[model samples]
Target chain A: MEITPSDVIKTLPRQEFSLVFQKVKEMEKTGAHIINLGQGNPDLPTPPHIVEALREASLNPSFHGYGPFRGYPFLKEAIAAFYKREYGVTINPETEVALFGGGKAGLYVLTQCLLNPGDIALVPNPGYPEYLSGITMARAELYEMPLYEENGYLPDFEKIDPAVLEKAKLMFLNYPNNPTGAVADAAFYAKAAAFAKEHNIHLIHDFAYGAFEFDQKPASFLEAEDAKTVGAELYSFSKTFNMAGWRMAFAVGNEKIIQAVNEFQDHVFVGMFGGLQQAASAALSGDPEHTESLKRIYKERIDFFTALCEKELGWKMEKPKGTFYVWAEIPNTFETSHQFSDYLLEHAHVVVTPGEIFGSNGKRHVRISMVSKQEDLREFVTRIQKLNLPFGS
Target chain B: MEITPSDVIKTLPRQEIINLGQGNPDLPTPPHIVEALREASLNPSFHGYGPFRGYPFLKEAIAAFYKREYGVTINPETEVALFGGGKAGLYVLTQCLLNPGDIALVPNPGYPEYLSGITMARAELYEMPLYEENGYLPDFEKIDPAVLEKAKLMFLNYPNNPTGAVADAAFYAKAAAFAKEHNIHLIHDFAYGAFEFDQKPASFLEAEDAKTVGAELYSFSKTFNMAGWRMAFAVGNEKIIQAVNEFQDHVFVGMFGGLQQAASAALSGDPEHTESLKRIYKERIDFFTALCEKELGWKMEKPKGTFYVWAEIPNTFETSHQFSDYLLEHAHVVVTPGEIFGSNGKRHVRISMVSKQEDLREFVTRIQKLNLPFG
Candidate 1:
């Protein structure tokens, strides 16, 4: 019998992103000056101190053995330090933390561990697709929480049907959201924590973009007091630390979830690489200067973008409160977000991710990343100036 | 919610026995590979997430190594996918190939991960006994035809681990034929392939139909002493490599790019470092086996390929675990009970030669200090 991958792997809706990236590569090959604001691959070099630590640690022989499966104590404590310093969230690093190859793997492993084959998971519409992938892999059902622009891109717990919430064993919520860049404050976290506890639903919070808030730092879900008893939160070195390629992350808060992820990890991985672990530990414990600096950079980019859209183009766009993503509804001139995305690529030589990939509800908006350099950002705006039409360029 | 590890790990006998209990070799990674990692770590290019399949440089290096060393031609693009390690490689392969409730054929005296992988897949194992009479090779014909009919995956490893036996080209050919006939996908783990002394062990791909039958996993751990670095690759059967890579895409972001560079350097460099490792293990094997023979009056089979001695326990001990326990309690010497491999090893013990020579020497000294009634 010819082997086909499980329906779960085959059915994941990531092909559109892959296809767009491929087209961007082809455009570059044909000598087009393509400015890609599609993905979150940071161009900044990892902090010099982190690189120095990795370089020195690679020379040591003692650290070069098969290590424990969860994480070495130093890395765990380093993450505890990061949470303590950044969010003042006190966690038992030994029991509440589990390290993973990346934040992606952490979510996938948790889904496989907690969800039985036919259980329900409450996922956000226009959310990170990894949640859908996780639900699929666990052979679980998904109940979507439709994120509305009118609702500030946050899910309204009351809007969810009673039956769906009753059946959902787990739910995913993100602040400084991908694609939307929406940050919910302390009141929202408290309400979410209370809802999850009262409903008996476990919260899987993605705090990946937590470090990118422009004005007020995002509150930790654990800041809700009862959050640790109700759910777990994931944090990573990938985004703000500019260590995306190194693939280091930690999930913290709940004791049972940490144990579950660790038990599965013990079979699949020996541990993270020692050099990467030490480097990650150093990255976590060293300073907040890098993320603090990074937030300034993203804030400036968002400022430049907001000015271009409102002052220059007269288009509909929100002033992002946090994160590097610029989510904007299209001009009445364009139809679907994919059509608008294709128009920018064809006419302006710019590549932006169509929000349709996030969810059906996101089809009218395009998600643009602020990952390019200042000159490239200028060029992206300059190229979009090519879309001269009946309205305004 | 408290999770404990398996008894195999929790009750490992070597807390006091010079730590030969672990399969991790005590050798420091070669200076060249370490330097390669140091250089790569300093280079900003290696700081990013590599391709999920692995860095192309490492894949090309592995392809070149296999072609020149083993005369096996392979398409690096389609036929090779890098894994975090051999253990991770095996687990994913099992997950992809075996459906739940489909039986998997595994060697009873095999690495626990193979059994664990199959168990995790919700598959039953059709144990293939490695008998001493068959020179530590499994007899394929003796497997119940019913088991063969149901089994879809077979794991074959050589130079073998605990039994320390090597299989030749003829044996591999027979295994390939059997797998083909049984409609099973063969998995050959060559983690210990490079340390052979007397003759070069042929790759499973050397069996003429091997490519059609299975894939092999080669690791950087045993040959290059980069176990902690966690780099390995699977090759052969483009579909199999594709399947493995597909599974990896969901579970991993990517391996540390610096480790991929270190593995590439290990596979691409001259064989001098590996030859030095082989020479070291060979010397340890020769000296320790000689010491056991002369001093303890126990004549174990001289290891031909892997770094282990498979010997019958003394007549005084009724069980291998008993003698192993006795060594731990009294002599402060550690040994693996043969029963850990399978029932056939119940009266046998496995002695590993991967520890430091000083540790091995003291192990022999402690055994001599036992002054048992055996001889």
Candidate 2:
């Protein structure tokens, strides 16, 4: 029998990151000392306390049966407490929080929950590629809000077309942003919430990198006045607690949207495992020292890599305000980000993600992940220096 | 915006009742499997995202299981894909295969998730009635030709849910031929494949050319009592498997590594765990059904597969809801009203045999006190 794919399936963008990873794997097979940094997979193992919690919970038979469709109540309460302690925000654990397998899963489901066919979503152009997946599946359109360098990589909502605004039902804003390594402030969030309220649109703030502050601490979207009236914030344990393998996250704010997410999941999922939920609760509610130390680790790696690029290669770029990435602009010697990335992988044997895959605004930029060890970061800089490429003006 | 809260469950009177309604297994996962998860949880390699579809080790285990259990050869790399659960796989299949306005053939009195999955795809559903006289299987000839022309997919499940009816290889061959001729892809949910009162339940892939037209969904929930672990896989058609994996790539990375390791252990470890599960369910089914007939004056044929007893409502009741309500109110026992499964399920109720034998006997004892008309 012939299977005709849905319209949405036919149009899914070919994820270039997958291709880059594949290429790097082939290079590694040749036994080359390939310096790879083209991904976001956390290299650190989960904190010892979290793993111990899961190990202890696994022995309990109650965790082996199906849990509540929404999730364990204790984990939700932990999320509320964390928000209050860290961001000074109030949350109703029962009505405001919706748990998902991961932050990506929550963000993807939000598009389907809020948008109708032909409706528009405001997506940041140079942002995480996964955000578009839900919009595509929802059969909705996205009006890309370009993240200009002059604007500190934040989306300028004032420039968006009024025509798109009329059809837009929701918008996604992530910070400290992906691909560009920029963070947002309180005033920006307040304005973003105001814009959403004025236009009757819902806001989804991707706070994935909320804990990795290098300079000033990042502001929560909920910290903005009446932000809960117009939006929700998604928090993940993937980067914060190094529980990426555990796959746990939740969304808070906007009771209606949270209810919709929970209802939708009730149909397809039988909630997450209880053992993992217990571990996640421990991760969220436990001492913030592990999280604080994790941030310090990324900050040190960023500091070393950025300084080495400046001194050794004569290539300088603005230090990232947050996130484990260096969004470097391609020098005049390279025509495109792809060419620069390909040349490095081919000549210098160093791998970096080409920016065009993020969106059109990322054309001339490439993202360098600081997730590698300091020794490997230095080796990457050394390898690039051997290529004799033209650098800083 | 002020929205008033209204919930029906909150208003209902609460009391202890024999909960023989939902299908969640009562037993804990086998100790060996739990130990496997514990070991994997401590490994640093298992603490990160796995392959987008799943790990090859788990996929190979599934292939080996198929070969050992059904004598079917599966291409581990291309034919096997893991899901969060079998239910999620069912929903994603329709999302990948159907376009809006296309028709999908589903079973009457089927798993409600089948209908929900179709709705998610925006596809039109045409329920193929399953009659008791036909051994609870859909008769292909009875479907309307107009619907057959537009239908792109069909869902077939057995040993079936709600009805507890079993199908052999011959029925699957017929279904496969019907689907191939109609150009409709088949989705065979074998979630209950591990349970049977007599012989081992047949896999849909046992049919000739079944792999050419459809795929089968197998879960660890029933066989290993790992329902909360949320592990399952789909195998058979290469195209369908690839499409599902491709779509899943956008939605999730994959199951957690530790869970996948545990599921792999369940599949390849030993047959003792599964054999014990079957023996337990069979014992409970035999005891409960026999007790119902002699003690409660309710007659029912023993189910061939699954941990459920599908029985017709007594003649005194106008609807299954009335009969079920009477049992809850008077007997303090709960059975699922048939109409909840689908419209064709009217005047019938499904009693889960997941409860322990003592509890089941107690349920019968309570119902015996009602003295309702069983004739």
Candidate 3:
């Protein structure tokens, strides 16, 4: 039997976002000076202690062979402890912990394992595009849970069609959300969990940005006492630990669901690298000073960028409540966020992800990252001011 | 849904002679070892590596993640260039040469890639036995054609149904003469290339050494020659490189069919740790030699345990081959054949193939309706 790349290359327009970003990296002929805010990756080295832990633990011969298909006990324990320590939430390590090659794999495997063909899953209208790709790959039908800016980028649970709610097997939620950077409170989590439980639907909260809260500590699904009974959460080391190259993530809460997800992952791929495990474990357990420092740097950059938008660009946008981004509407010139990003890249040589990549609510907005060095941010603002371009034009 | 272990366990019995002789550590264990193996693997530390290449490419990294479904590439060019020059024969780097992980995944994006599986198109056997008493558990249906033989292991072109008849030397001689005409170069290679090719079939010459020849080599079909060919031959690294910890002789030539061939023999599993063990074993032997020499200062002990450990158990056993019989009669023990030992262990055991001659013959017979080409 002949197999070709086309057999696997997913055929969808949004699936092209990652490829488009990669193509931009190659097409940019400038001397490495383009400001990149296109990807969600953090631009920092792993903390020294994390690197040290990787080196030390990798020396053990026992760590070399095949690991458990689910996850190592220590890693599961650390994930549980991290939530308890940071979010004041208790999770059962055994039932809640599911390891995956990356958050993408977790999403893919969870969809494949839990969703039967034609089963409906509730997805946010302007959400992580992977939600669409994952649902398609799993051969599941999808119903959009419309998110509106007026609603503070939150889903209106009451508005969901009762029939659709009954049909949906799973619902995906992201808090301190991507692109919009909206942080959901305890009320949101409690309401969502109750809704899911009532419909017998599984709730999956994407908490990759949970630790990046700026205004207030973001509440987690686990903050609801009934979270273990109704929902699960996915966490990744890529964002928080500046380990984007190291694809690692875990799913916690709702033991039965986690087990099903882990079983699927085990057959699809082997465990993560022994060294990476050590590195992640160390990062999770070693120290908080590095994280605090990163938070401080991001906070400063966020303030500077927001001021530049208001003064130079004459744009009115809310400062991000969490995350290292400023979601501002590109006024007057382009109707769509994609167009704004394209115009900025061609003229200003500044690259930022279009809001449409997140969802339709982001269609009018663009996400500018605080990842650039302070000096680079200063230079970038100067270039914008010199352009003297009007808000839309 | 509650999933049980039995739901996943494959129920194949271990092949005795052929399987016991091979040295693949990732081979699934009996039902007993499955529980411990599964239990030891539940930690999240055991999850997540999506990159095409493995986490890192150090030798240690390769060894640790060898058979664990991690994708490992083995480019022979790279290994030889780093290790120094050698012949450009059918050299295969077992660990790095193949795609990592499960065989089925090589063609799929999300599945683990197994290069060895791609090369051999061999399905992994789980929970199979390989001890001699069980008579190398051979399943003839799966044996590849290019590796069949018909001399000491006779095959009448006519499909016979289990008849008890021992043929004469004339039949073997005719088979050997035919094999020679077919350009079967049987003399040049012993352990590495030759064994890889010939050990899959029965040789007329092996029957001549009735007292010593404990294994037989067979041949079948040959097709592609590309290094990346779906299947070819594994050469380099002589079979003598591995240590045979045990040995016994019923003078069975049927057992050496599935021993670790080229790509399967690379350092992985417990044997990957053998190099360090080899050093310690050599050092101890050296120390003993020095003591003997110091007593008289004449000569030192010759290191005989470099690749195979030779020992004399205090028992009234006849020939070294019969040592296994003595153990079996007294200690209820049986070992492996010497021809399969590499440089890592003592004579208490021997490594051979995991499939057997009767199985090969049966497989060939079963498929006789296909009208396969044979001399």
Candidate 4:
């Protein structure tokens, strides 16, 4: 037990994002006027109607019994129906949709089920951290595709090294993406699907921020023809329904991959509580009002500060098409992202996530979340103005 | 997916055949816990993804529960690692501690999830046989020193599943000392701990240096009849707990917050409800044991703990599977083929006392109707 760990264990560093949040928490305890925006955690309550349904279902004895490990049929049906109405993609609830405890669990399990150790996967550099975690767990040889500003923060298919691209067994993509705040159109998706099909590899698309598009609607990978023939797509209640704490999400596509994920979960978990399934069923299918409101909320929160950063402060930034994160370039006064982030935390008492944490391509940028209150965004910019911080010319 | 499943998945998913195969209590969750959940659901703080390890308040409740129940002090902040199920905790522990090709010692005919967890970790397994003659406890002395050196983790369960053998403090102390000597990390599954009948079962944590050598995972599933509400935690060994926490950070967002609140309440509450639950299982066990031995002429030991009755297969069949299949076809009554638990279990079948007393009597009549070759 005291011996050294394996490469599988060694690959996962013990990153401490939460302990750093404690700094803000302790500051709040001392009544410091801190605007904490490091976390993507949404503070909005799950709609009360969803709460009441779960509360009632909890008392039902049958609801207290173990449900299907793949997930409840009702919830799957909801997921399938919701996807068709929202994204125009046909989903077979039985064969296509598999439930997860959360989106991260879905992503991790899918990687475990699909990729073998020493096998290669084309994952995005400056991507969501889970893609790395899953790759590490699989012990797969990683080929991190650079998501640079020159490439519009998207993976350039031609730029990928021919050797790695030809042999990699799987590819991971996310957009409306996390960290970089990039959104992909149907034309881009079509080419990616054609590429994966030609190379005989699987594609995993994370549609977590699928609902937070500004001037355009987001598209599921399955919206492209023959997408399911190549891979699966994961959707979550966390971002759209403000139910991250509720621990529910569903993946729908590539029946073979879905089956593999189900088999893996069957061994590890005894399925989720049925009451939570009922609540997810109600949330996914019932109303689109809360989702629409969320989109508006994020769009406004991003617009308010991003407007100031660009038009008023003479900074280089763009209003991202989707997601709560506003990825911005720091001024020449700061050499690294951490320096700028640390300076904001110390001088202005505002916490923002440094971009290098996502990937080294993000070293010159930082991510500010719109998950905090509207008033906090106002106060954050006010503090910036009052401090009269240097901005890029 | 629309395809044929392996026998492994197919054999599970019980139908309405009296549900003796399941370990969950038939009783509904207590209204107090339900009420507690309802209150927690109304709170907005719980609606966000909670702390990756667990909410501080929930950990404190579990720590308090252990301190009072086992009289051992715990640092709630560092020592407790919560999981969706005790199985999840075991699986994560396996991942955190064992590397591929590393060996682990597991109990034969124990919880099947132990095997599943170890296999998923890609570790080779060396099973410690739990003989009836040994009161279903592993005979650690029989294990070779070579194996002890290679084995990175060992699993111990009591008031165990299938066997219903109660805990022995002397045996636990020996296990603790042996694990310490061998540098093995022991994992004790205490899911059935709250169901002891004759006397209070000793907590594995009560043994000297238990914290240094091993960790105990207590589940709210069986004790509170809330299997669907998956919540449990690993306590002790700060290093192991931290490893599990870090592994979990990449895999899961924290569990649903409402259930955490419900689990928190159940842990901090008095033992009265748990006491009543144990008494119910006790009465059912006694009545059914008498019924089986008297009119049915079947032989079984009176279980001192757990709600299961493990007995030999009738002489008509050489394996428990045939006996179970025959019963399922003829009598429409369901029971677990102990072979599913392990190879030695091939000769025995396990009957759970979770069903109604009326159903137990009905099962007696059904088995009598079969009138097998057993004398």
Candidate 5:
């Protein structure tokens, strides 16, 4: 007899990064120096204060045993303070906050909490790949809301089909968006909130890159009027504090959604390690300068990379306003983003993620991560300049 | 809205109550494991996501632990999968194996989370009651053929919770044969695998074909006193392990690297620590059961494994809940009313031996004042 997996498990989509990783390995066999920038993982180490906090907290016996089912109160309090301090948004520590192993996990949990089979989820095209996995996990229907360059990569609610609007129960919004590096404003968030309320759609605003903005401070969905009535924002510790490996994040917004998440999690998990919670708490409350310094470092990297692209290779492109990625258009010398990405890796030994992995809208683009060190970034320019690809000017 | 033990304890009007209800471990994780976490956290490479399934080091450690302890060789790459906790794996396993409306055979008066996992998977649950008469083991012959025909998965736990009955190698072989005949996947939870009071507990995989039919979940929470760290791994059939890994990719990333490293250290560490832990539980069990029988008139045999004692309630009280409430209100002692486990558990209550010995003594003395009749 053969073992058969459930249809949902069998149909679960693979992470797009794995494909990039596999291709990068093939290139490495050629004995060429590789400047890989295809991954979203933060390249920096976690802040010293947070590490020290974990060291201290791990010593205390209270943290060595099981914590409360939801999480520790001190961490929730810290999350509440963080929203108030950064976004000027008030969050109730008890009812409105739900902790997750990661914001990616929270994204998947939200679909399970809100969507039943046959219910529709409004997902952005060229958005994060994890959203599709959640929809599949819930056995829910998906309607892609295309994120266009003209609209600053924010989904325009006006363009959605009337039938889709009526059936859709959840909408996922992300900003400082992944892959695209676009940020949402207060006006855009308010519009989204009103649209969700009118349509009775619960919004899940993924703020994974909330702290990586360049031109201006990014807006939180919770800052919009009556946003808590219709949606919640997922805040991540991965990029914000370089704690990706720690697998810590939380969702703050509507009480109903938060309660559903917490109740569902109660059965599935005991709780996070208390020491991790303490370290995350320290990250949220310890210092404002750390995030500012991080922003400065990314800004410098982005500036240097974009400047080098224009100067050395005649590959003029706009610097991303947020996120550590540059959503650069292919030089028009190639047929598709994958073709250009493969060409770059083969000829220049520089690994870039093709936009098509995100969605169909990304077919014309490739996402370049600014995760490489300054020397590696300079080396990347030197390697790519040898290709002498088609230029805009 | 589930009535957990904590919910009942919360309403009990006072603070000085002796808690013998919840099964959380009472001791701190060993210092060597704690030191491992500190050292691993400082490594810059581990600061990023370790690996999708888990770190290879942790998987190798798990494979090594199973071989050395259970005499079962596991292919770390294909046969082992990691979860944040065993509970998470329990929930995900159902999702992997059972489609909506598919039947799963579960044990009645067993761990409550088993039912929760089935419900979340949208599967129908059929209970195979673990009666005291059967040494808390399910008799496969007693299950209806119709229910067995539709059942895709079966859950078994040895060194079982609520009732600390350990299954022998022969019984595990019987279970494996039953599953093989029925085309059902077995999930044996070995959370308390290391706590059996006898010479040594039998590993489910020790059964001739157990690895071909199902997998077992081994937890660090109970064995290493690392409940807060929440690490556990499943080892068994390659297909089941792959299903777990594939499904886990969508739901969660693997455990944190530092936690995984600490778990690795625990798995690869000296057996002396776990042996000492077993000794501590044994001492507590002997002391607590003796006091209950002598002073409280709660005549109960010593538990074979786990840190809990399952005792028949006094005849004066009609239900386990009633007896439990009477003890809580009168003696300020907490015990889990077994009805929460299943309908069959209504005549018994589960007392955790996790509290200090002095607290256990006080619990019995306080209950002695009630003057209820027991066997």
Candidate 6:
């Protein structure tokens, strides 16, 4: 009965993204042949071996009830090993690893664990809006650190205001950034780590899109070694392994933060279903050649769509080096991202995520996902070309 | 982290009894027991359920989650029900029904919908004196209202205590005569015919047993037509039909106090499990009955146990209830009342119920039928 905190309810406003998803659901009900490039879910079955492992593990009776609060030993060990194998960074599986029901739940619980009421957390502008919701739910004061186009959508340590830094206890950074699709480099990590260490702030690097890099290997905060000493990172299988619905993700590094996160997680939820842990473990340990093929397909689609935008729509946009999205700036139109998104969806039947959902700085752009198949991408381009709207308004 | 409430931990102590028919887990291990119960659920199966009906529901979902905070919605319903069902009727399903994980966390998501704490609302008393010599424990607070007793108990009431004092003849007579003398007024509307009214509380003319009866049936409270009203006299199935007749005859003098004591003993430990045990027994009975009809080709297993006696064994006591009582009385040793149960065989045994005269009559009829079955 109105007992829940008003702030929590207010933070989760139903936005255009939700409205578009609802419309998509409605369209799907009638079985309309719409090219869906709006959502970020993969269209593939869970790997056969991962499914097999899950099937075998489910046969074990122990999987039926509650498991350890942190995670199953084997799954944690595998997660640690995967990190070491991929990024060449050694991590303590016990003190550094914490399992979450999902990346979203993990982020929410972590915020609650670390932030006290009125404590300021430095959230990246043009980042995941869910991060802002998490901060609000924890009753933390927020100070936005803008991710500007001039800085390649990455944080410029020097640009962070001293006043904001004084009040901040935690800084959240997302790389291969959402909406913008900008990837961070080693130099950026070095600068951020130096800033955090000097300021005594807890730096959080969200590596949700690390696996989707096309040209170069994604630089993880853990790779900096010094960053791991002062910061933590979250890795999710939702984007990488096409296991969004499965909802298994891990936060590792920074022992103090890990323990706090674990404490909050233990209270809010039991450990993930044992079978899900088993499946995730298998997905991590098994061969990833097929995952590479999917990446290659995304690369092809990204190139094709970028070329089509240049040719048919005369919309010139910077292509993303990593992640499966294209952040396209709507030229000369209404400056706000919401207005642009609403107009496109209503008139063109082409849905995309509004940049304002990320943050105010993203108000001029829209995020288009390259998660669809090649045929769908081509059809989507054909549909956009048919609209023939005046350039930028 | 020493965060959970202590009363929550102590409320559900284990107990043992002969357990005639009570709630109990039936299968040794049901199939998929390993997969679902043990190996800590893995993969797609455990992951697919959404937040509304899944672990979140298990964690924070309760009746209050569905109930409107400001106004009641007559048709609103909850998706996830509490695991044990509401027992104490204090906390709402959300506050009380938490999994192990949620309990470990702090600032426990508010107490269930009800605005009450477990201990402040319920009182408890311990039976004292441990027995090392006679190997017995006694009900220590014999004179206290809340003291749980093991043997025959009497509740003496004075005339001043109007409800209890009515035990005497004059007072009882006045109450009885008040009903009988007003028969015309009472029976006039029920039937439009002449009705015989007896003014005698214990009338010899009414029945032959009334003349020399050691104990006369003393009925209290009239039956109302409402479904919620407790029926003073009713009849149904033959077994129950005959039992009600015998129940009218063997009404014990000053035994209401004994029933109260027994009820106190039953509630002393883990009322949560006590309620759960009832459902468990019903489930087992259904399963066993089905198995008998389908597999072994048999019909029934008589329900024997009462909740009080059976629930006080291995989980509740370390010794036998009889021995504990003896030790308490003789050597100043007090033990739990249900300790009389032997642990090893307790789980296998059914708790015995206090049988009524109707049960004895049925027994006699069955025995007589068995001997004459030549046709």
Against the true structure, whose DockQ is highest?
Answer: 4
lDDT of 4 by residue, B1-375 (tens): 122223223324322166677776788877788888888898888788777777888999988998888798899988999888886787788887787777889888888877776776677889999998988888898897788777889999899887898877788889999999998888999999897888887899988878888799998888888887877889988888877777888888678778888898888777899999888888888888888877677888888789999988887696898898998899898889998888868888889998889998888888889877555
Which candidate's lDDT is highest? Answer: 5
User: Where in model 4 is the C-alpha error above 4 Å?
Assistant: A1-16, A19-21, A28-31, B1-16
Q: For candidate 5, give the docking quality class from DockQ.
A: acceptable
Off by over 4 Å in 6: A1-4, A14-17, A24-33, B1-375
| Candidate 6 structure quality by residue, lDDT tens digits, A1-393 | 011113322455535335644665757786545555565656654566766676576555455333465678999899988888888788888888888745765676566566665778998888887788767645678888888888788776777688777667788998888878888888888888888888878888889888888889878888874787677898887778766656678898888777666544433334655666888899888776967887787888888889888887887878898889999887674767777777666656667778888888887788998866777777777777786755543
> What value of lDDT does candidate 4 attain over all alpha carbons?
0.81
Computed on alpha carbons, the lDDT of every model, listed in order, comes to 0.80, 0.84, 0.47, 0.81, 0.85, 0.48
DockQ of each: 0.42, 0.48, 0.03, 0.50, 0.45, 0.04
Residues A116-219 of candidate 1: C-alpha lDDT, one tens digit per residue: 66678999999887888877766779899999889998898998899887668889999989879889888898899888888878888999988888888678
The TM-score measured for candidate 5 stands at 0.96
lDDT of 2 by residue, B269-304 (tens): 888778888999999988988888888678897999
Cα distance off (Å), candidate 5, residue A200: 0.8
Instruction: Tell me the tens digit of each residue's lDDT in model 5 across A215-327.
Output: 88778889999799898899999999888889999999988888777777888875699999999999999778999999999999999999988888888777888999998
Chain A accuracy of model 4 expressed as TM-score = 0.94
| TM accuracy, model 1 | 0.93
Write the residue-wise lDDT of candidate 5 on B1-375 in tens digits: 111122122221111189898777899999999999999888888777656788888889988998999899999989999988888889878888888888999998888888877876778889999988999999899999988778999999989987999899999999999999999999999999998998598899999889889999988889998888888889999998877777777666676788888988898999999999889989999898887777866789788899889998877778998888898899899999988888988989998888889898888888778788886
Ranking by DockQ: 4, 2, 5, 1, 6, 3
- How close to the true structure is residue A326 of candidate 2, measured as C-alpha lDDT? 90
User: Residue A316's C-alpha lDDT in candidate 2?
Assistant: 84
* Cα error, candidate 5, residue B266 (Å): 0.5
Task: Give one digit per residue, the lDDT tens place, for model 4 in A1-393.
Answer: 444346335655533346355564757687767777877888788998789889888878886656566677788888888888998888988888888889988887788777776778898988887788888887878898888777778888888788886558889999998888888999888988898887878888899989887887778888998789888888888988888888888888988877777677777776788888888888877778888888898888787878766665666578887899898888777899988887887788788888877888778888888888777887787776666767866
Compared with the real two-chain complex, what DockQ does model 3 have?
A: 0.03
Between candidates 1 and 3, the one scoring higher on lDDT is: 1
> Largest TM-score belongs to which candidate?
2
